Design a protein around this ligand. Sequence first.
Ligand SMILES: CCN(CC)C(=O)c1cc(-c2cc(CN3CCN(CCCCc4ccccc4)CC3)cc(C(=O)N[C@H](CC3CCCCC3)C(=O)NC)c2)ccc1F
Ligand SMILES: CCN(CC)C(=O)c1cc(-c2cc(CN3CCN(CCCCc4ccccc4)CC3)cc(C(=O)N[C@H](CC3CCCCC3)C(=O)NC)c2)ccc1F
Ligand SMILES: [Ca+2]
Ligand SMILES: [Ca+2]
Ligand SMILES: [Ca+2]
Ligand SMILES: [Ca+2]
Ligand SMILES: [Ca+2]
Ligand SMILES: [Ca+2]
Ligand SMILES: [Ca+2]
Ligand SMILES: [Ca+2]
Ligand SMILES: [Ca+2]
Ligand SMILES: [Ca+2]
Lengths: 626, 626
Amino acid sequence: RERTVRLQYGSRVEAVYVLGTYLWTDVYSAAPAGAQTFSLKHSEHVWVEVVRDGEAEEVATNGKQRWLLSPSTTLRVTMSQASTEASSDKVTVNYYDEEGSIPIDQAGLFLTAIEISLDVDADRDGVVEKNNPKKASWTWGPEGQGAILLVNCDRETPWLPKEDCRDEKVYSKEDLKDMSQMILRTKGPDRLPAGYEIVLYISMSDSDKVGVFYVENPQRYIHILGRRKLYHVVKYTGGSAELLFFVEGLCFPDEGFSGLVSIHVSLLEYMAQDIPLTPIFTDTVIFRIAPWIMTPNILPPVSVFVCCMKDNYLFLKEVKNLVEKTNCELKVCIQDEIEFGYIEAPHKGFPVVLDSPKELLGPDFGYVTREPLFESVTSLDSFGNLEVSPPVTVNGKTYPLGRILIGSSFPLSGGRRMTKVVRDFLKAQQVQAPVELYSDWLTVGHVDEFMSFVPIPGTKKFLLLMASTSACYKLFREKQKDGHGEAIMFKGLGGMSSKRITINKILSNESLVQENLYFQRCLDWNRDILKKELGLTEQDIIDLPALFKMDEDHRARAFFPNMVNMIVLDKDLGIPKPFGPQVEEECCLEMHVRGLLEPLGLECTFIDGTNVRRKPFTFKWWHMVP
Amino acid sequence: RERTVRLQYGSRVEAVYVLGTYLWTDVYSAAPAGAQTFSLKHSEHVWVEVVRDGEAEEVATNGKQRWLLSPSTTLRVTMSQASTEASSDKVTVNYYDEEGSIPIDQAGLFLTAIEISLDVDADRDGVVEKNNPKKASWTWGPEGQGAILLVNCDRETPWLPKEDCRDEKVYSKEDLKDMSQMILRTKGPDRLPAGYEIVLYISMSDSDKVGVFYVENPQRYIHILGRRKLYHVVKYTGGSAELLFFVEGLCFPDEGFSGLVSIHVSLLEYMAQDIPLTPIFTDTVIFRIAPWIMTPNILPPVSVFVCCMKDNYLFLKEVKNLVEKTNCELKVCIQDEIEFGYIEAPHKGFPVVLDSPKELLGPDFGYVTREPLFESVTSLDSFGNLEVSPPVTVNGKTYPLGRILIGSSFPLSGGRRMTKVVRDFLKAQQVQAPVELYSDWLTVGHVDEFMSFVPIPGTKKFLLLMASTSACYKLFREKQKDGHGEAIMFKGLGGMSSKRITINKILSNESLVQENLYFQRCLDWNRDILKKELGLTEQDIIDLPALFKMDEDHRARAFFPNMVNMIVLDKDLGIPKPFGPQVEEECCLEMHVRGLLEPLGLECTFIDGTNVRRKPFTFKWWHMVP
Ligand SMILES: CCN(CC)C(=O)c1cc(-c2cc(CN3CCN(CCCCc4ccccc4)CC3)cc(C(=O)N[C@H](CC3CCCCC3)C(=O)NC)c2)ccc1F
Ligand SMILES: CCN(CC)C(=O)c1cc(-c2cc(CN3CCN(CCCCc4ccccc4)CC3)cc(C(=O)N[C@H](CC3CCCCC3)C(=O)NC)c2)ccc1F
Ligand SMILES: [Ca+2]
Ligand SMILES: [Ca+2]
Ligand SMILES: [Ca+2]
Ligand SMILES: [Ca+2]
Ligand SMILES: [Ca+2]
Ligand SMILES: [Ca+2]
Ligand SMILES: [Ca+2]
Ligand SMILES: [Ca+2]
Ligand SMILES: [Ca+2]
Ligand SMILES: [Ca+2]
């Protein structure tokens, strides 16, 4: 900051100087008519150069020198420490004519130096450092810098019908732990010279994205900037001072919101009561609002939310028994209305649930929805149609939080699609760079019908499980050749089950073969996208046998329990029970799925839906580089 | 592109292969029950590896080998050259049981290889190279790559009431010179196997940003993609073929439009008449739509558009005489409704006029407006409030096309502002990274009232001229001390002029002094922004004397002709005539302005408004790095 302050003909000029800046001071134009030259005195804690065509030259407090008056002779004026005294520091210029050695006129400059700094934790260690030089920018990576702000989308006080950030009020001191600290630090005399004040302010635009709070009697919580509050005039305390504000995020990154917000402080000069003139100093901090992040299946489970809204014991017992052999909780009352994720800042973080188009909205449990407006919901809006990969590297790039996957239709198909308003939210989060797959070939239309990830438990590595109809046909032709043709299929369930569906019955159904050829085609289309977009190879993929029937819409609905659609609890796999053609003790499908999976570390339990909240990534999203 | 194609139990499978891709082919799952092993034959121009847990292995056309059947034993299938024959190329697998040496079943794959490439001039030399590997991306800098598309905002046929891009029709072959070439190149047999076609397509979103044309009888101009045309089915010509399309841009970069657009081609498989299935190959080109670019005063003038809509001869004659001593034209009938700029691509470029909230819309003379909607126009929307710097470097960054400057008010002032819709357009152009100044302290509210750039003609360097009231007062106190106090001011003009305004009269007006102190403050505020944002120093600045009077709104209107508000024609400066206090032959203001400027190369002519179209930058905007 080089800033202009001219001397004024015949006058003394009072100026505030902010430490960190430079004054350039015209002396020429204040000079009386007929002067040819000037000297100057200045005070101890004011540094003063003279400057002609770029050539600097320090000058003594005391010296008696005279120079030639000229528009290209100017001063540069700096100060090193704040004033304890309103003025005291000063620069005084004497002007002189051809003859005499007494000055003909003089002009002066009376400085009050102050320090003003609006400070944030741009280096991201949870401590509000002093005037971080990067605090007005935001960069990615471990070298990156720039403060981080959470959306205050949880709830501290449960009598509130909505989340914290929905009001312009802080009710509990609990709340402030979710907030980001911003410190106005000042250093100067017992007061400001007359005509100055300090204003914090925000833009109209940012006014619905931030809320700023002052804690009085640090007690009451003063809402100073935010909705319908674009500025706030700050009472200066003299001496070395610090004001503490707490900042809450209100809106997630989204369509038309990068997630970056600014807050400013200005030293504003006034002419009277009212009559604002111009700022003489401005300081600015940047915040990025933390994205919502989804949790893939490789990440350790913390709790498993079931909800059979009926009378289940054996679904409750095989899901309870599985959960027990893990660290984690059960949590009864699902997969289609709710997606678990989190938000993190260096100070703080907590789980947030995306709610599909309220209920778990608690302390340290946050909440977002996105609401269509014109576009109608379909089946593809259900969060069974929303999954996320493990960490992957795709051709050099790294995706340390994985990628979101959403089922879709082809763009010129007229098919179903998840609402744009949810699609836009998810891409706007950036850090899980979403991928559209093709799920609309399915009656229901969900990615979780045909793929799943499982961690290989020694690693540190995962596998893509894919449904495969061709795998199924290969298996049946073996069984039937093994003499199990007349072995009956799907004897178990108590609605639509088996009127002697045998393998033979199936294998000789030519119509159903062709449908399943079309479906294998839909599957291979997805396989090619997943391989490309998660940088996978055939090494990384296991095809689980699967069979569909083609409904009236030309869409697949499962023939028997889709086994890829499982609960992944670390090493325990909760895998739907197929009920299929036997050979002895157990099923030849169950034994086949046990065949592929168990030799890798994976411990399959077959269950006759759920949802699992998981540990965050250790990996900090700000260290990424999207 | 690794792409899945399975063999199918007992069947022969016909596939199209696109050169540049890889097939992965499952053999396991097509295998009959009880086989333990497979061999394979394949044709000359089909390369075939076998692959287990990652381990490759080429195989002979001829060989007789057998391998062990297993899900992790698969093939990889490539081809090197296109087919002249529908099929001919092929891969055939034999399956075998424990005993016999005759195959038990077989499965085959019958390939037709074709080459398909959608090509553009992503390397930006005006030639459409062959399958540029970067043609699906857009990058900046001399190393950057990515094709460029002009907005077709000029007019070839003048019977049209609007610009070319306003219809979905090309009337003249002239037009196509403004268009970008995109070449669908194919190489294959006399026809495609049954069930395939080639579709060009665009997104709904891009559909109002691009228009694509086919030239028939290369004759008629076929509009194939664009408004209400999202796809087009292409007739395949056999052999080595090339289809030529011409692409027009329709919309400039803007709020919510990055300026990037995509065009795709897919090979789409069908089941019947209708019944589209899935694409088997897709290719994509990217275009960036060229920004509108403004021309600063250092750039050589080409023509000077005057328009005194009255009876001017001495304004016509001093502007004509000045124009004559330059290369350039006069062009009579201005500065406030029109801004001259251009658009460039590697093939092509032409002047485009931004029209402030039609007339010069010609061949190779284009047109944009932006139209407010809710927001009302003010004086600050006039293009006197729109200027552009010379090339500058600001703290490492380079701005080789300069920066746009717009006068504004303070954001919490309730003051006037140029319409958002024009502000958003200008920033969206990116390459001249606009700067908001403070012009609302002026009655009219234009940046051109208080600053101007002039080229120093030996360089290669420019100067910022600033209006200065303090300079004026310094000058008058000299004159009055020189005994010119009673020398009369502003005797010339024929409306509001002089009832013995003398220097003395002015100097003793204390009220007017204070107003001009406030105005010098407004000026220094701007000075500080310009220094910061154009990386200038005091070396680079000349203050021209100037005086304002404060209207009822607390706003400056010039006291005498604002001399900074000049025509800059290379070395000739067309500088408003002040009419001020004399000493002999000429004015002491005129002689003072001649004093500062002429010693640098600059050749001042004083004129008792205009607009100048200039040469583009030699510098190509795509070599920048915003
Ligand atoms: C260039 C490709 N592309 C751009 C990326 C696509 O978006 C694309 C489009 C579709 C698609 C699918 C369906 C619906 N699906 C639903 C599932 N169905 C299963 C068939 C099952 C048959 C069976 C099998 C085995 C056994 C029994 C039965 C196939 C069709 C209908 C339509 C449709 O009619 N579109 C037209 C316009 C079209 C323009 C582009 C060219 C094609 C026309 C239209 O609406 N006009 C206004 C289009 C499919 C694949 C694609 F890649
Ligand atoms: C923190 C600074 N800031 C944020 C970046 C600003 O945007 C800012 C604002 C103004 C500004 C100016 C005017 C208009 N200008 C017009 C020109 N005028 C010349 C005075 C001429 C006097 C004279 C001289 C010499 C001789 C004779 C007369 C000054 C005022 C009116 C108002 C106004 O009344 N605003 C309030 C709200 C405000 C919130 C912030 C703090 C200030 C109040 C309001 O509308 N409430 C709802 C505000 C000026 C400078 C600034 F930097
Ligand atoms: Ca810190
Ligand atoms: Ca709150
Ligand atoms: Ca809270
Ligand atoms: Ca909390
Ligand atoms: Ca899910
Ligand atoms: Ca080229
Ligand atoms: Ca046209
Ligand atoms: Ca044209
Ligand atoms: Ca043209
Ligand atoms: Ca202009």
